[PDB]
Amino acid sequence: MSISISYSTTYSGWTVADYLADWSAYFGDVNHRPGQVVDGSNTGGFNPGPFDGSQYALKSTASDAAFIAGGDLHYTLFSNPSHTLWGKLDSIALGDTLTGGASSGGYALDSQEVSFSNLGLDSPIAQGRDGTVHKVVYGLMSGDSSALQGQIDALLKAVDPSLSINSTFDQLAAAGVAHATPA
DSSP states (O other), X not given: OOOEEEEEGGXXXXXXXXXXXXXXXXXXXXXXXXXXXXXXXXXXXXXXXSSEEEEEEEEOSSSSEEEEEEEEEXXXXXXXXXXXXXXXXXXXXEEEEEEEEGGGTEEEEEEEEEEEEOOOEEEOGGGGGGSHXXXXXXXXXXXXXXXXXXXXXXXXXXXXXXXXXXXXXXXXXXXXXXXXXXX
């Protein structure tokens, strides 16, 4: 199946690129780096975790922005290649108001704005921190969504070369890729 996109009607006239650049500016950089992961405030979490699961979720420490990555995901922690996320990334949901976690049966994003599904990404452990899945998710943690933008640009061009991250959500809905959701 081709990339599927949802978007709240209030973003109908935005391009994908402008939405993601703006979301990244609100989320900011959670500072997930050596000496700066000292407690659970900026780790995020897996369901079921602690290091693997079908969801990885993180809330911003600068805003209420949050995302959930869905698929079949694995984090190496200290194991070579250290601090690598690899595996199957099917979906990214972005917005605000993260709730839940492993103990309550799953994460939910109560103010989801936009989602991207059927991403078809599957990165092997061998690529380490240069894997596409790793770069996509670490970009969302660190205030730079350029890796996600590039993957969406390629998936959209695969549907039709007239579609891109510079398409508005409106235009993607007319093309049958995107679907407006209630605001």
